[PDB]
Each structure stands twice: as structure tokens, then as C-alpha cells.
Amino acid sequence: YPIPANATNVPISIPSRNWAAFRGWAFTRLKTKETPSLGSGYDPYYTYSG
């Protein structure tokens, strides 16, 4: 989920779900500038290489 400029407060909302097990949580940050929502080779969005 994207977080842009001048919007520092973004939560997650998911409907009723039947999940059974759970080990815990781990979150960190990724940039849209240095990678897109990838699932293929050919993507014109990727203009960086860092």
C-alpha cells in the first residue's frame, strides 16, 4: 500500500478472515521510486537501478 507526501497516517483495513495460526509481525519501508509492483520482466515504470 502506498504512502505519499503530506500523508503521514495510513492504516490497514481487512474484512472478516478465517486465519488460524500466527507467529507475529515484521514491517519496514520500500520505495516506489526504486521498484514498482513487480510480477513480470517488461515494466516501463522501473527507471532506477539502485
Partner: protein, 439 residues
């Protein structure tokens, strides 16, 4: 002896095993490299979690049983009449390119083969054959004007107007006027240095010329096999039944258009034009036309060529099939019909083409030869080829299924050739299994 699904309630008998498309529409990593042809729909429509994420999940036929079912195909692979991916947009044929004074007085016979490109998108019979004439108008000017040939021995010319309903059997040629111009079979003009190659392009089942055996590759009607009775001509379009000479002897050196008309200078009946229709049913068939080629009612697309659709993960192999899963050789589950159902209408916007259809679009690109009266705008039959695209309902046979279905079921479109089809939006498979016998 029920089914299995993720953390919900099973049912009793006659339950489902899905191939739904909606969950495959939003995901960025199921279909992003390949098209709808061999994409990855989840077996799963899990409404009790985040949409399109239960990918490792599969609706399972129990380890207890070995069931059997059917496949649903609602296909929308709409292939147009003229495109790069179907055999109508290229043909390799002999055009006259080069003519220049080299030695004393004699003209050298020189020949080359160069590409042809046509506008793609049209469907009509008064437009498919019409823009194959454009291939000529485009060639003999770029290479063949400064270094080559005149508007006389025009090769690779695609016609439709008939020739042997002009031959009035009295002296030889047409006595008062010109060739016939109504509803007849489409055929091709070939001249001293010309020959249209069909099987090189696989243009047999479309234009007008077909094979008895669409198996051999190497087409031959290159002004070699076409022989019997040559193409009628005009003797003197200006003198029969007007002034009295019986002008059957003095023919077509001095008339309406002087391009050294292919009816030889002071001849009786023989014209240099060697075409397809002239000796099929009219004359002697042995080595000529009927033996290797045939006359047929035209179809817009290739017809009904057998397509090899599958949802293979679920049916291990129905009766006689070996498995290799990527996009080279998908295991077949039967023969289906691709949505290219031929439509033919009766109208007369094609018969009347010599006056209206030539002038409607104001350009010199559609046609460049107006009234030479052998090589011009094609006038199609009363019953024309109309490319109509409609989602048609057709399905496979019957076979038993797998023990485990596997995490992802792959919806397959194996079209005309064993590869991807570019133009798709629909790809489904509503499946219902049923009980037979235990293991």
C-alpha cells in the same frame, strides 16, 4: 464422499472445482508477462479473505476417490480478417523491377523479389482483395520507376471479375465490347515474369484458390500449370457493328488505352494473360487446373480449424495424453471451435463496383489503373465474405480427473497454431465432478 476447501463447510455429491477469472483480474503477479492464453487463474474464489491471494490453495477431490467431470469454455479470441498473426498479410510473388538499355536494341529479362505490405483492419471481399492490389501500386514506383518497368506487364495483380463469360465463341475474342463484370469467382492475372505463391503464405482457403490436398507445400500455377484457352480481349473496341472491314484481324494496337495491350500486335485470339479460371471446368482437365487446385465458395477466415483448449491440471490425461506444462506443448483435452463462424450475406454493393466503389474515397492509393479493362478494382460476387465476431458456445468430451488437482490450474488457449492468441478478455471453466468408483 465429499470435496475439500479452506476452513469452511464441504458439501455431499456433485460439488464444484473452479477456474474463475475475477480473482485473476486484479493481481499483479498472476498475469503480467503472458496474456489470457496461458495465464494463472487461482482454482480459488476465497471470499473469506483478501481478494486474489489464496494461490497455494486448491479445491481438492478427496484422496479417497478418483472422480470425473467436464470443462466449460466461453471463448472470446476474436481474430480479424487482415492481421500480421494470420496468413493474409504477406505474400511473396514475382514482380517486374528492372528495365534499362544495356546493350544494342534487345530488352533484357530481369527479375527480383521484394516485400509487400497492406493496410490491416478491413474485412470485406470488396476490400480484402482490393488492398492486395495496393501491394503493386506501392512497389513499381519506389524501385521500378527510376530503374524499371512500365504500366504494361503488371504482375502480382489480384482480380475478381471473370474472364470466360466474355468469350463469345464466334471468331475468338469479344466482338463488340469488353469482359464480363458481375457475380463470379475471384481469380488472379499472371504475366511474362510473374507467379503468385499461395502455400508460402497459406492463402488457399480464403481468396478463391484452394487445394485438393492442403498438405504439400510448394504452389504451382506460375504461368506454367495454367493452360487451355487464353483470356479474351478486344479486337477493336471502336469498329464491330459501326463502319463497313470485319475488324477481327486488326485488334488492340490502336484503341482506348495504349499500353502495348497484351493482345499481341496484329493477332486473332491469343492474349498474353494467363489466368486461373480460363480452363477449370471449361475445356480439358488433366495437368492444368482441376487436378491440383479447385473452385470453392469463399470463407472470410480459415474456416473451422481445430483448437486445443485445456484446464490440464485437473484432468490427468483424459484418454491419450502426455504432460509438459509450459507454453510449447500443452496436453490436449479434445477439439473445440474457435469463434470465427463464417457469415455471408446477400447484397449488391460488390457487383456494382465499377462506378461507385472506385470513386467514393478520393485518392490514388486504392486504385491507379482506371480503364485499361483487365487490371482494375475488384468487384466481388452477390454473396460476399463478412467477418463477424460473436462469442460461440462449444465444449469438449468426457474423461476422469486427478487425485490432487494442484495449487494452480492453468487456463489454456491453444489457438490456430500452438502458441498464444493476442486478442482475449474471456477465459473460464465452471466444472462439476461426479461419483463413479472407489480406488
Amino acid at each position: 464422499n465429499s470435496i475439500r476447501y479452506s476452513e469452511l463447510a464441504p458439501l455431499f455429491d456433485t460439488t464444484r472445482v473452479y477456474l474463475v477469472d475475477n480473482k485473476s483480474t486484479d493481481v499483479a503477479s498472476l498475469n503480467y508477462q503472458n496474456d489470457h492464453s496461458n495465464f494463472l487463474t487461482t482454482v480459488i474464489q476465497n471470499n473469506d479473505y483478501s481478494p486474489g491471494e489464496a494461490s497455494t490453495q486448491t479445491i481438492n477431490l478427496d484422496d479417497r476417490s478418483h472422480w470425473g467431470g467436464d470443462l466449460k469454455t466461453i471463448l472470446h479470441t476474436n481474430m480479424p480478417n487482415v492481421n500480421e498473426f494470420m496468413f493474409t498479410n504477406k505474400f511473396k510473388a514475382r514482380v517486374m523491377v528492372s528495365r534499362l538499355p544495356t546493350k544494342d536494341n534487345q530488352v533484357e529479362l530481369k527479375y527480383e523479389w521484394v516485400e509487400f505490405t497492406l493496410p490491416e483492419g478491413n474485412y470485406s471481399e470488396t476490400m480484402t482483395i482490393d488492398l492486395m492490389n495496393n501491394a503493386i501500386v506501392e512497389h513499381y514506383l519506389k524501385v521500378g520507376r527510376q530503374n524499371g518497368v512500365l504500366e504494361s506487364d503488371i504482375g502480382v495483380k489480384f482480380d475478381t471479375r471473370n474472364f470466360r463469360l466474355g468469350f463469345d465463341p464466334v471468331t475468338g475474342l469479344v466482338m463488340p465490347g469488353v469482359y464480363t463484370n458481375e457475380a463470379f469467382h475471384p481469380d488472379i492475372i499472371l504475366l511474362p515474369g510473374c507467379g503468385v505463391d499461395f502455400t508460402h503464405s497459406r492463402l488457399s482457403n480464403l481468396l478463391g484458390i484452394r487445394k485438393r490436398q492442403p498438405f504439400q507445400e510448394g504452389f504451382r500455377i506460375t504461368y506454367d500449370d495454367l493452360e487451355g484457352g487464353n483470356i479474351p480481349a478486344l479486337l477493336d473496341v471502336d469498329a464491330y457493328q459501326a463502319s463497313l472491314k470485319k475488324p477481327v484481324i486488326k485488334p488492340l494496337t490502336e484503341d482506348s488505352k495504349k499500353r502495348s495491350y497484351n493482345l499481341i500486335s496484329n493477332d486473332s485470339t491469343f492474349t498474353q494473360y494467363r489466368s486461373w479460371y480460363l480452363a477449370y471446368n471449361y475445356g480439358d482437365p488433366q495437368t492444368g487446373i482441376r487436378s491440383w487446385t479447385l473452385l470453392c465458395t469463399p470463407d472470410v477466415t480459415c474456416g473451422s480449424e481445430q483448437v486445443y483448449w485445456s484446464l490440464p491440471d485437473m484432468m490427468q490425461d483424459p484418454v491419450t495424453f502426455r504432460s509438459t506444462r509450459q507454453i510449447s506443448n500443452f496436453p490436449v483435452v479434445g477439439a473445440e471451435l474457435l469463434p470465427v463462424h463464417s457469415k455471408s450475406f446477400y447484397n449488391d454493393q460488390a457487383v456494382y463496383s465499377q462506378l461507385i466503389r472506385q470513386f467514393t474515397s478520393l485518392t490514388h492509393v486504392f486504385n491507379r489503373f482506371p480503364e485499361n479493362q483487365i487490371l482494375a478494382r475488384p468487384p466481388a460476387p452477390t454473396i460476399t465474405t463478412v467477418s463477424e465476431n460473436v462469442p460461440a458456445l462449444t465444449d469438449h468430451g468426457t474423461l476422469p480427473l486427478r487425485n490432487s488437482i494442484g495449487g494452480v490450474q492453468r487456463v489454456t488457449i491453444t489457438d490456430a497454431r500452438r502458441r498464444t492468441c493476442p486478442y482475449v478478455y474471456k477465459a473460464l471453466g465452471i466444472v462439476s465432478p461426479r461419483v463413479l468408483s472407489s480406488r
